[PDB]
Design an enzyme around this catalytic site. Structure first.
Site, PDB file in Angstrom:
ATOM      1  N   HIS A  40       0.856  -1.220   0.000  1.00  0.00           N
ATOM      2  CA  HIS A  40       0.000   0.000   0.000  1.00  0.00           C
ATOM      3  C   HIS A  40       0.887   1.265   0.000  1.00  0.00           C
ATOM      4  CE1 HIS A  40       0.439   0.020   4.531  1.00  0.00           C
ATOM      5  NE2 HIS A  40       0.138   1.267   4.423  1.00  0.00           N
ATOM      6  N   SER A 177       4.058   2.827   8.135  1.00  0.00           N
ATOM      7  CA  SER A 177       3.629   1.904   7.011  1.00  0.00           C
ATOM      8  C   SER A 177       4.797   1.320   6.273  1.00  0.00           C
ATOM      9  CB  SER A 177       2.897   2.636   5.950  1.00  0.00           C
ATOM     10  OG  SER A 177       1.989   3.396   6.747  1.00  0.00           O
TER      11      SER A 177
HETATM   12  N1  LIG Z   1      -3.048   1.913  13.597  1.00  0.00           N
HETATM   13  C1  LIG Z   1      -2.164   1.288  12.872  1.00  0.00           C
HETATM   14  N2  LIG Z   1      -1.482   0.302  13.376  1.00  0.00           N
HETATM   15  C2  LIG Z   1      -1.940   1.684  11.551  1.00  0.00           C
HETATM   16  C3  LIG Z   1      -0.765   1.308  10.798  1.00  0.00           C
HETATM   17  C4  LIG Z   1      -0.581   1.710   9.460  1.00  0.00           C
HETATM   18  C5  LIG Z   1      -1.588   2.488   8.928  1.00  0.00           C
HETATM   19  N3  LIG Z   1      -1.705   3.002   7.733  1.00  0.00           N
HETATM   20  C6  LIG Z   1      -2.834   3.659   7.678  1.00  0.00           C
HETATM   21  C7  LIG Z   1      -3.379   4.402   6.405  1.00  0.00           C
HETATM   22  C8  LIG Z   1      -2.335   5.239   5.567  1.00  0.00           C
HETATM   23  N4  LIG Z   1      -1.140   4.806   5.277  1.00  0.00           N
HETATM   24  C9  LIG Z   1      -0.504   5.701   4.597  1.00  0.00           C
HETATM   25  C10 LIG Z   1       0.789   5.657   4.097  1.00  0.00           C
HETATM   26  C11 LIG Z   1       1.206   6.803   3.399  1.00  0.00           C
HETATM   27  C12 LIG Z   1       0.321   7.913   3.237  1.00  0.00           C
HETATM   28  C13 LIG Z   1      -0.997   7.898   3.773  1.00  0.00           C
HETATM   29  C14 LIG Z   1      -1.361   6.750   4.454  1.00  0.00           C
HETATM   30  N5  LIG Z   1      -2.488   6.437   5.065  1.00  0.00           N
HETATM   31  N6  LIG Z   1      -3.433   3.568   8.825  1.00  0.00           N
HETATM   32  C15 LIG Z   1      -2.682   2.846   9.613  1.00  0.00           C
HETATM   33  C16 LIG Z   1      -2.909   2.481  10.902  1.00  0.00           C
HETATM   34 MG   LIG Z   2       8.538   2.429   9.595  1.00  0.00          MG
HETATM   35 ZN   LIG Z   3      -0.143   2.915   5.995  1.00  0.00          ZN
END
Ligand SMILES: N=C(N)c1ccc2[nH]c(Cc3nc4ccccc4[nH]3)nc2c1
Ligand SMILES: [Mg+2]
Ligand SMILES: [Zn+2]
Ligand SMILES: [Ca+2]
Length: 223
Positions: A40, A177
């Site tokens: 993603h 991420s």
């Molecule tokens: N609570 C968590 N453990 C969590 C981890 C990763 C994540 N990722 C997103 C959406 C998300 N991931 C990204 C990456 C880059 C730009 C925008 C974006 N929005 N929500 C989450 C929540």
């Molecule tokens: Mg990292």
């Molecule tokens: Zn993310």
């Protein structure tokens, strides 16, 4: 990372920052020419930055290398985030040293209860936005699949696992991420998704790397 601490400069030497004019995702260096991140986080025009601590200051231990190719998992589903893993090849091999090292891929999957280290430059507020400039760390255990599935009914597959605290307070978050979840010296997870960040009964969900080792090995050896 919410409820974590400052790692310390270059204490997580396999951590990478993916940059497309700004930091947008983390990743893990698996050998001098390859990085594993989350699908993603896919974008065109990625520069991989190794040896970073403060991502807004050139402190001297960085290596900025562009990607030559990116490979998203053949079965990645953007709607469910199932098979959320991607491989990035560097245009030039990185020079490994104390500050830049690769992480090992696992020989078996880890058991619930195992404590892991999660790191990244993602948001640090559950309710708010505060993005840090230095690397943050968080130690969290793998949770049982039962508590993971009860939190997200019909959404967890065998390619995912939850790690964290059901009480809330500590979790990875957007910006983390693609980053690493290391348990016992092996890369066991990739920061994938969750419900908000650090909410009660909403642990973080991670890509279960032990299920992709043959795919990773086969793909890097043929590219
Ligand atoms: N609570 C968590 N453990 C969590 C981890 C990763 C994540 N990722 C997103 C959406 C998300 N991931 C990204 C990456 C880059 C730009 C925008 C974006 N929005 N929500 C989450 C929540
Ligand atoms: Mg990292
Ligand atoms: Zn993310
Ligand atoms: Ca820097």
């Amino acid at each position: 990372i919410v409820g974590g601490y400052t790692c310390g400069a270059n204490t997580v030497p396999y951590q990478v920052s993916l940059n497309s004019g700004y930091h947008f995702c983390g990743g893990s260096l698996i050998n001098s020419q390859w990085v594993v991140s989350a699908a993603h986080c896919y974008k065109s025009g990625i520069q991989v930055r190794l040896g970073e601590d403060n991502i807004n200051v050139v402190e001297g231990n960085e290596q900025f290398i562009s990607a030559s190719k990116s490979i998203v998992h053949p079965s990645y589903n953007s709607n469910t985030l199932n098979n959320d893993i991607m491989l990035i090849k560097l245009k030039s091999a990185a020079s490994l040293n104390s500050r830049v090292a690769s992480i090992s891929l696992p020989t078996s999957c880890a058991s619930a209860g195992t404590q892991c280290l999660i790191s990244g430059w993602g948001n640090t507020k559950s309710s708010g936005t505060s993005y840090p400039d230095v690397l943050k760390c968080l130690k969290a255990p793998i949770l049982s699949d039962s508590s993971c599935k009860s939190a997200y009914p019909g959404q967890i597959t065998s390619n995912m696992f939850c790690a964290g605290y059901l009480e809330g307070g500590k979790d990875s978050c957007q910006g983390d991420s693609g980053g690493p979840v290391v348990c016992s010296g092996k890369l066991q997870g990739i920061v994938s998704w969750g419900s908000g960040c650090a909410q009660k009964n909403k642990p973080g969900v991670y890509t279960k790397v032990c299920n992709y080792v043959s795919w990773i090995k086969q793909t890097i050896a043929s590219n």
